[PDB]
Every structure is written in C-alpha cells, then in structure tokens.
Amino acid sequence: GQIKINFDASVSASMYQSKMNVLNTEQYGRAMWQAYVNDGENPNGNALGYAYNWGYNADGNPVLYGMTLSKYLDSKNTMPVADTDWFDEITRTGVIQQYNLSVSNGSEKGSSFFSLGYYKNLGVIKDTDFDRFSARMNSDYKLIDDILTIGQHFTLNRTSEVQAPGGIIETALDIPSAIPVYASDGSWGGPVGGWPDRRNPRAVLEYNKDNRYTYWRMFGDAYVNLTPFKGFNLRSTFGLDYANKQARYFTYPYQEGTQTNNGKSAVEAKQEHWTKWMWNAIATYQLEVGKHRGDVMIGMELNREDDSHFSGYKEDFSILTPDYMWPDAGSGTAQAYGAGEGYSLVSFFGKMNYSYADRYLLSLTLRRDGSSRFGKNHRYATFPSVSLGWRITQENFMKELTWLDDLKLRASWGQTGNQEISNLARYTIYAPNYGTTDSFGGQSYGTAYDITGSNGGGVLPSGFKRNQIGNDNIKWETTTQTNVGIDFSLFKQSLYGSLEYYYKKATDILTEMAGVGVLGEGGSRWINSGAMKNQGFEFNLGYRNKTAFGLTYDLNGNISTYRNEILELPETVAANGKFGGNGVKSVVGHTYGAQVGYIADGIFKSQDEVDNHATQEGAAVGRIRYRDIDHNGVIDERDQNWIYDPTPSFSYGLNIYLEYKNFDLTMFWQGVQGVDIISDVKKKSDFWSASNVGFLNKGTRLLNAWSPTNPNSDIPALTRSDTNNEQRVSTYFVENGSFLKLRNIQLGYTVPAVISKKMRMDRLRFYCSAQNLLTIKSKNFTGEDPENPNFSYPIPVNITFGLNIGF
Amino acid sequence: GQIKINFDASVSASMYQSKMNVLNTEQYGRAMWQAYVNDGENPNGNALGYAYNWGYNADGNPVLYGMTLSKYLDSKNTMPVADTDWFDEITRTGVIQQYNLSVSNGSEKGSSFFSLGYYKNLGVIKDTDFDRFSARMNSDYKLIDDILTIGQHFTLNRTSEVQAPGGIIETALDIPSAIPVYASDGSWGGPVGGWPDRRNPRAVLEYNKDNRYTYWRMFGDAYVNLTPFKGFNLRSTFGLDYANKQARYFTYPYQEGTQTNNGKSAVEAKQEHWTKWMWNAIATYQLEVGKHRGDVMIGMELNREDDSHFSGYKEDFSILTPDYMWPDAGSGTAQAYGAGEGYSLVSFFGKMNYSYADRYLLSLTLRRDGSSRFGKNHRYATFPSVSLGWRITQENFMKELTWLDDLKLRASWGQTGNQEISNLARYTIYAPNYGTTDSFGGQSYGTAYDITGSNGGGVLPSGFKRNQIGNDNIKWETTTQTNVGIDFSLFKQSLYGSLEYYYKKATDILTEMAGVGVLGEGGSRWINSGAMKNQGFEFNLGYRNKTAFGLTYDLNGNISTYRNEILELPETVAANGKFGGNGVKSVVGHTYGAQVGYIADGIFKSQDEVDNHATQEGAAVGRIRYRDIDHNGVIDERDQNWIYDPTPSFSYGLNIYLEYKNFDLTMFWQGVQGVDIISDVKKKSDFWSASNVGFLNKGTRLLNAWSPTNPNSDIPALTRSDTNNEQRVSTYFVENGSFLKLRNIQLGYTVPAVISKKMRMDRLRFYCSAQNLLTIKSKNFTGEDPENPNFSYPIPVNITFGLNIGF
C-alpha cells in the first residue's frame, strides 16, 4: 500500500591511459637505417626521402651520425613531413551521462510501475556517439481476489549511434608518423610515393561521421495466473520482442595523396527487422505435511524468431550531403540486397522438489527441447537432473558444535544442450551470388560471366555457387555436468564459505568445420565433432563483522582452479587443428586451444654460432636460433612441440566493503596467476619486416633490436626481409600473462535521514567510482594488457560521479 | 476503489448486394450487331468471332434472327468461349471478427488500465485480408497527494494486410464476358486476337496474393501535472508516434493469351518510417467568487514529424516463390529508391472563460500557429475568438414559463487556419529523375540520354528536371467563422432542440495549381487563390419519453441546409476552371464545383429533325440533339450554360431508440433531398463507343438503345464512333441524386441482472446490427448509389452479431 520514487543520475569519463608506443618520424628513420645497414645496403637509397649522415666506427661497425628530412614528402610539395601521433589524434575523453526516474504504486488489488531513462555516450573515439531513450511500464491486476490474476510487462527503447569503423585504432598505429593530418592547404593528408597504401584514419572517421543507425526495440509479455485450490497454479504467458534497425551509410569521394576513390559517391539505405514471440503454459503444485514438503511443476514453451534485412545502394550524387543523398537522387548504378532467416523452438519440461525435515532435499528435472535447426531425426533431445542435499548442522548429532551455524552438502548431476548454430547448418546451400557485393581485391566469387565476349553492357548470364555442404546427421551437442558442494557458515555468520567441485563434459561438440582444399568451394560443414572435459575447484570464503568503533567490514574472496582436456576427435579434425595443435600434433589429451610450435632459443651472436647449430635456412648473425627438438641436425617442420597452454594455474577475486560514519568504500580485485598468453603484437613491436605490407609504423621496441653496437638483447636484428621465418609459431610469441587488477573501486556518502527527510525524501546517496584503474602484470610481459593480449591498446579508465536520490 | 472488466466480441458479414449489370456474351454479341447495322456495316465482319443470322423486316429495318459463336475464341483452340460473370468471380462474402478484453484498476493513490484486442477482416475481394493486434496500457500516480501527479498513456499495434490492386473491381466490369477464367488446360485465361488488351482480373489477384505489408505503430505520451495552490495548474506533456511499414511486392511472369510480361520476375522490398513527437506546457487558473466564475489558460506546443522511405528492386529469379525471391537471389538488374520529408509546428495559445450568474457566459481565445511549410515572412498566423452566452430561462422575468426548462442563446466569432499542403510547397524543385521508376507507355521524364550514340550498356549522362515552381509569398489559408445558436428544452426534458446558423468564409484558399501549357514541365505551383463563403441552417429536434406500458422512445432528428459561393478568384484561376465552370465560364458568384456544359435535348428521330436543328457536326438520326443556347444557328463551344450544382436543397437525419422488456432497437436514417449528381457511369452503360479503348464490356442499358425498332428511348443509338462528341459535358450525365437510406439498424437484448450476476458478472448484452441495408433513390437516377455516383458498385451490407459481457 505504498508509492515509491527513485531517481538515479551519473556522469562518467573515459580516458585511454596508455597504448603500444609506436615510432615517431625520427625513430622510424633511425630504425629503417639500422635495418638497411644490417643488410649491407645503402641506407640513403631508401624510397621515403630520408638522408642519413653515417659511417663506420673504430671496430668497423655502422653508427648513425645524423639524419635530415625534406620539408615536404613529395617533389610537388603538397604533403609536408610530420611527426603525427595518430593515436592521440583520433581519440579523446569519452563522457557518459545517465538519468533514470522510476515510480511504483502498491495497492490492495493491483500494482503498477513506470520508468523513464536516458543514456548518452560520446565515445573515446572521435566522431562517434550513442544514445538510448528508454521507457518501461509494468502492471498487475488481482481479479477474483487471489485465485485469478492478470499482468503485463512492457519496455520500449529508442537507440541511435554512429559506430566507429572496424579496426580504426590499429590502422592509426599502422600509419607512419611522417604523414601529416592536413595537406599543405586544408585538405586531408595522406601518403605520397612509396608510403603505405593506407588512408588517413582521421579522414576515415570524418567520412564515417554521418553513418547513423536508429534502433527501436519493444519487448514485453502478458500473462494470466489461475490458482484453483490452495496449492495449485496454472500460468500462461505470451511474449514479444520486436526490434528494427535503420540506417544510411554514406560513401564520399576522396583523393588524399595516392589514396583514391576515383570520384565515387554512393549511399546504402539499410533496413533490419527481428521479431521474436514466445508462449508458455506452466502448472505448479506445492504441498506441506508436517515435515515433508513437496513441489511439482510441468510446462511447455513454443518459441519463434523471424528475421529479415534488405537495402538499396546507388552511386553518383551531385551534392555530397546527407540531405541530398537519397537513392532517388542518384545517377549512377544501383544494387539491391536482402534476405531473411528464422528458427523455432519447442520445449517440454518438469521439476520435482522434495524436502524431508529441512534436513534432506531432493530435486528432479526433465526437459525435452526441440529445434528447427536439426532434421526430424535429431529434432528433440531429453535432459534430466538429480540434485541432492543434506543439511548436516540440523541433524541431532550436530547439536554439540555451537561454532557452526550451517553445513550444507549438495550433489548434482544434470545435462544441458547446446544448439547455437546457423539456421541453415544442415543444408547444402547454393546461392545465386551474381557478384553485386563489394569485396576486397577480387574474391567476388560471382556466378556471372561474359560467356558471349560482348565485354558487358547488359545483364550477364549467371548461376549458382556452393556456400556449404549439408549434414543429414547433425544433432545436439550434449553437456553432462556433475558438481558436489560444501557450503558453510561459522561463528555467527561472520565466516561464510563454500567449496565446490564441478566436472562438465561436452559430447558431439558443434562447429562449423571447413573442408579439405581439394573439395573446394563451399566445403564448409556444420558437424558434431568429439568430446571435451572441464573439471575444477572453486572455494569462496568470507568474513563479515562490525568493529564497535564505527566500522563494518565485509570481505568476500574466491579462488578457483580448472583443467581442461579433449578426449575424442574425428581423425580429420585432429590433424586439421581446429581445437589446437597447429596441424602438426593432435590436441587429444591436451587442453583446448593449446599450440605446437618451434622453440626460440635466443639470437645467433656470431657466425660460429650459426655453423655450430643445426642447419636452418635463414640462420645468420642477429637472427633467432630455433631449437633442434629431435636432434637430427636440421631445423625443419618436425622441430616443434607443445609451447602454449591457456589454462591458468588459478584465478582469484577479492571484494572489500566498508561502512563508516555513513561513508562506504568498495574495492573489487580479480586476478589470474601463472598463465601463458600468445600474441602477434610482437610482430609489430619487434620486427621491421614481420608483415605482408611494407613501411608500416612499428613499435618502439625495435630501437633496442640486436646489433653489434647492442649485443645483449632478446630482440632480433632489424632486417628488410624475413628469411628466417621468424613469423613461425614459436615461444618468441608466448609470454607470462599473469595479472592482478582492480576492476572497480568506489566510495560513497549516504546522507543520514536526520537531514535527508528534511526534503520529504527517504534516501539520498552520492558515489564516486573508478573502473580498470590499476593493473599489475608480469615483468616479462611486453604488451599493454595481459588479459586481452591481442590488443595494442588497453581498456580505458572510467571515473564516474553519481547520485541515488530516493523518495 | 474498484476493479472493472469488459470483454467485447463480434463477427460481421459483408456481401455486395448489387452492381452495375454488364453485358453477357450474348448481349455483348447483340449490342455489337446493333452498333454495326446502325452504321450500315456488315456485322459479320467483326473481329471477335461472332456469326450473325440477320436480315431486314417488312419496313426494311435490321432485325437479328440468331447468332452463333465458336467453341474457342482462337483458331488454335487454347481459349474457350465463355459467359463469365467477372464481378461474382473476384468477390466473395467478407467476414470480420473482433475481440477486445479490457481491465481497469482504481486505487486511492493511482490507477492503471490494460487492453488486448484482435481484429481480422477477410475482405469481400478475393485474395485480400487484414489483421490488427492491439495493446493499450495507461496509468497515473498521485505523488505529493493531490499537488503533483505523474501519468502515461501508451498503445501498440501490429497490422498486416494484402491490399487489393487499385481499380480491380472496375477492370472486372470492363473485361468482356466471352473471355474465360481458365484456358483449355488449367492456365489463366485471357484475351486472344482483337479482344481488349486487359488482363485477367482473377489472375491479377492471385499474382497479388503474396504482397503483404507488416505495420507496427506505437503512440503514447507522458505528462507531469503540478497544482501549486487551490486553483493553479502547470502541465507538461511529451508525446511520441512511431510507425513503420515493411513489405515485399512480388512480380511474377505471365503469358495469358496476348497478355504478356515477357518473362519478367522481380521483387521490391519496401520500407517506410514515420516518427512524430509532440511537447506542450499549459498553465490554467480557475477561481470562483459567489456569482462570478473565471478561468484563464496559456500554453505552447512544439510538433515535429520526420518521414523516410526506401526500397530495393531486383529482377530475374530462378524460383518463383516468396521464400526464394529476395534481392540477394536475383540475377537481373536492380534499382534503388527512397527519400524523406518532414515538418515542424510551433503553437502559442490562450483562453479566458467567464460566467456572471450562470446566466451570462463569455469566452476569449487566442492562438499563434507557426509552420515550417511557409517562409519566415508568413511563418506564423494569429487567430482569435469571442463566444458569448445568455441563459434566458435563468433570468428572473422568465419565471412564469414552466413549460420551458432551458433556453440558451450563444453567439460566436472565431478564426482557424488551414495549413495542409506539401512540405515543399514553397520551393522550386529540381529532381535528378534519371528514369529508374516504372511508368505507363512512356512518360518517364528521365534526364538520362545516350548523348554519345553508344546505344547504352553503361551509365548514361543525366541531369535535372523541374517538379514545381516555388512561391516566396505563400501564406496561411484563413477561415473566419460566425455562428449564432438557440438551444432549448421544454416540458421535462422531453422535447430538446437547437437552431444554429453558421457563416464560414475562407480566404487565401490553398491549392496546388497547375501551370499554363507554354510554361511546360514542372509549372505546378502552390498558391493562395481567392475566397469562398458557406452559410447555412441547422435545426435538430428531439422527443424522449417513456410510455408507462413498458416502452421508452428517444427520437432525435436533424435537418440542415447550406448554400455555397465563390467570391474572388485570380483572373487566371477563374478561366482555368479548378473551382468550376469547365474553362468556359467563371464560377465566381456560383457554388464550388458547379459546372458549365451543353444541354442534351433528346434524340434526333428523323433526318428532318436534323436539318431542322442548328447545324452540329455529328448530328444524325439516333444521335443526341444539343441545344442552341444563344440561337446563332450552330452548335459550338458557346452553346453551354450552368447545368450542375452540388448543393443539396437540404440534408436530414433521424435516430430512433427503443427500450422494451430489456430489448433495445435502434435505427439511424440519413437523407439528402433535391441534389444534382454528375457521373461518367453512363459512358459505360449508354454507349458502345464513349471510351478510348474498344470492345470493352458495357452496361446492360445499351440493349434499350435507340433504333427504328425501338423509337421512344432516352438512350442514343449504338454506334462504333463518337462523331457527335456525346462525351461532351452535358445534362445527359446530370441526374437526380436525391436519396434516403438506413445507415444502421440494430436490436439487442440486455440480460437482466437477476440472471446475469448469477455469473459474478454485472452486464451481459447481445446485439445484432446491419449497415447500408436500405436505400431509396430517385426514379430518374440510373446508377447504383446516388451518394457515391462515380462508382458502378454500392457499399456492401454488413450483418454483425456481438456480445458485451461486463464483469
């Protein structure tokens, strides 16, 4: 019988703390010089306009005395030489702001709830942004007071956003610092001459800045609940989730140095729809007879989702503005795209709960799930569970232990299914694919051909191509799971804890698996392939207690270990290497994702060390010496072994909570100890040449590369050629990825009601919080963030200020 | 403090009662014969396969003895001769079904409402249908009990429909009965040879049957209401109306006799969006001092609507099914379409109500409206009103008249604005229009041209074309309105009535007005053009009374008259004829839509009657004699006068309501007396040749056309040529369109609560209703429905059965 009102608001800041340091224009000039003289080549013959003052020292070893650079990169003086920091140029402080206002009404014969919210992100990446209006409104109505009840939930979201382009950050670390942001006039800068065929990342963002989608989503449900006698309940629910995304993606002409669009201009008007509806019926019966308590429940749930998308594309526009650029206004050619897919799910289920004397618990569970992603012959799968419970401390013989409030012992066994696969997983798919979609450097795989020799100017004849081969025998991936647990609490709920042991084993694992080469186009197949096992230990422990000095602490920890192992694999998949082993060793009996590769044994420091080692092709002074695993006297494809295991030795987490003088302080720490990580980062930071495209910007670790002048370094000598195949899977790319970081720290003041209800307001609280602030890494880790070792940039820190006023 | 529940359900039937009777295969054969011999032509030389046995009578006049027809229409025997009734073939009984379930909850501190509804129409036209799911959910919350209130309304509709093709019915009355529905095998029938180039209407529906749109609409509003002291109120409202329509329109190959697609196949995936948001603030203050009562109110309202549509079109599909036919799967050419438009409205307003002694009322009103459809120089317009009231019977001197409960006298004066015009009304619009949209028989008006002589096979150069000429001086259409009223009630509310008099005059009327020919492409202009006046009389009268014999009657009538007149018109518009006068006389001083034309003076019955009449070109025996209005001795373009006025002499309406033994009977009658109507219907019913396309099916009135054998008939002699220009605007097409019809009759039983609350249900009512059942027309009207004289088909009757159970 109340009416309650909450209002929450906050503003957040997001700032990139660090990044992979990449070479500046002089360091880039120094590095290329070193890679030149390391190869006995005239460094003054470079294609990039650097002029080097150098010579030989007293021991006859290249030393760089000085270097000059043109004012402009090109003879025509349209592009000036720069020292651009591209990462700082395309990033900025993100700012987030949220406001939520809620109201609820409690009444004898019903209830109703209402929320309005707003959320605006100006992303850390320039020319991006995001906003979400939201409204939720729910209610219930007690007819036939307490035997027939009707209700509803509903929410409604409008979202609009300009997403960044994929890989925008990495391409900013890739483009050299000599290229300026702006040309000699005010146009967008770019590469001239031999500089990399990579466009201006800032200019790419500006050209992206108008590509904004508008996303509308509603989802709710309506239900009736019939209670015909004391313990019985019939409930039916109908659900609906309809969203639609709309956007225009604008293509504008560009011509920035050698980069060019010709004069292309186009617009694509994209539309997407997703409608998902759900229905269930459920019958539950509870009953209590002195000691015995029992609950039964049966149900059913039909699910459907229908998807569809489609677009219109058209080229050539007189006026390069969003106002002008609609398909009606284009004068060049047009393409029309679009398709749809869908899936349906039937679900039958039941449960049975029983408890003798709040001392012995037992629960049973049974579920048939059916899914249109399989043929009739595997459409349904049935999954049971048994869960068992013994509350020791309730037992009579446990009377004597007063320092033990609870000691529960649970043991479970259950199966669940995996079904997340393509909606066409089971089909051999032939698509017409005439060749109307963009694609890079070729690779249309179009079926249209000028069979007459016309040279075009019309509809070509065309046909069909294969996208995948079907599977008449594709079935559910089944996971059988077993865990036994011991949770407890001692003293007077001051020392709570739990010790669990789980053993999950997956069977008939589902993967889209590619095909063999000679089978050719569209050989990919959706298959059930082998079995995995994952068993481990979890052990959470807590300590909560006040100090009677004004302080409450509540310290909650968690440490876990797990080991993982593949058990069976079709012979073809094991040599393929999908699950690990890199195509040289089968990963059966090893952990999922473990890798075989060469072992990097340092750097040859003398020619004698080259001759004194098994013969290997690129072996030379300054190169990486790779180990002769089998001792045959040559380094070839067999000189590989297991060199990477993703299994951490353990993973932990500790949560500190303090209340004192109405202040409150919270810290969330999470750690991972003794874990291999594997990365390509080092191919950009440690090599001038470990890359298919030349003259890209590289990391700053290069300037400590190996040299006669610099003889005791892990980093191989700079070179313009990867003759030694140092891009080979090797321990050079495996690093100690152990870490410990503060996910969140947060301090808040709760305003005492003596002063807050001043304002006819119950609660009023201010909080300040910070995410991803601190990280402690291994010394021999050389990346940015060990938890995400593939990235050359970290997660940005967030500072937030907020209030939770509450009437 | 309640909880209330209504449930309404009904099923309706819709059946076309009558239609313009069109010729059957023999009547069509008879008619063409008559038109042949009437022209002294060998009727056996027709191009349609009829063979006629005929000759001359005793007086030497053609008489048809018999006629035969092939078994098949074509020499190759693929199309059999038929007597198809096409109207019966493409129509059926429509059935409608609605179900609505509502629940509301009233509580001290708030309220909430919830409705679910369903509506399914299988239309009277085959291969059409329509359905609407709907959910409404509203609620309010009394914070700061009765000074600060928060609320919300929201509704949500999903609609899906296959619309009929435009003019499907008329084309079924147009295609001759000799063409069969099915070919000799099971394919779709069509015309062969000389038969009209019109496709099979049934086959058109089947090809349309999969073109289904899916329409989602939500609209609601959220408001806060602040009442700071006793009479004051601040209210703000935010509103939102977002709908989106989605569809695929399928083009399938056809080849039915001479009708052909070649082998065309295509799909168009169309998308539309309409988002409309609204915001207002309003401040109201009420105050009462003994006799004086006064109310003031000020406010503001911003409005915006943004629209956008776009599609993708693609030709050529291997599999002619909706499952297959998405743009991705097409192999032919593609087109991309789409655009957007929008408008915004600002609105400032105020009102002032005052009443002395519930004897004298006065209200004032002021509103500035601004609209982005005008330039800054006419953006806003200001509108006032004065309304005045005197309650006579409350006056002291009116004490003596007991047979007079009320006698109110009201008098008003106010202005409102018209603003419904194109969003680009004020612009000179150049569109690129390359020529990518379908168009009939040419008329692309594309700007693309093969300027090089290539003959195509590429993007052509192209340009811009004009759609309309702008108007720097376009302004609001203003309507000044004045009405004085006298409403009353006598005895003891048994004889209620009202007598009103209104005088609305519009100024600066807005029309898209075309341009002169020599100005050419895109000469259409949005202009303010002249003034109109519309003044009339309304007089409603009622009589309600029970009988004390178990019967209540409540009889409510209405009779109205109006006369309309144009006052000023730019000289160019008056000779144009947009508002009337057919380009021969100015309609100034006449009613809107009145027409000048020739006067049809019967039918020449002898050559002497032809010579004895002013010389007119097509004059011959059996033709229409047209009057020599000016007596110059020739019939030419001056022999015209005013021959049509749409003003009815009056229009009435009577409503009967009866309650008796819990039954209830309702009849709604509406009439229009003494009114001209004007129609083209007669060109299909009365002429073999009053049409640009030959050999179409015609009405059955032809078989009473004029002939020597049939000399006393209004209908001119059948002929293959309209030499006499009987398609000229003439009194032949003007008819007495007076009518009286029963809009609705309805009978219902209300179940007495003695038996209904049996079921814990308050009210339970059954009703049966019928729409458009009866119509009484003028004898000298020859169409189907005088109220809609352009159509050759009536409005179908609806029988409905329904219940209104109410807990």
Ligand SMILES: [Mg+2]
């Ligand atoms: Mg070896």
Ligand SMILES: [Mg+2]
């Ligand atoms: Mg004349």
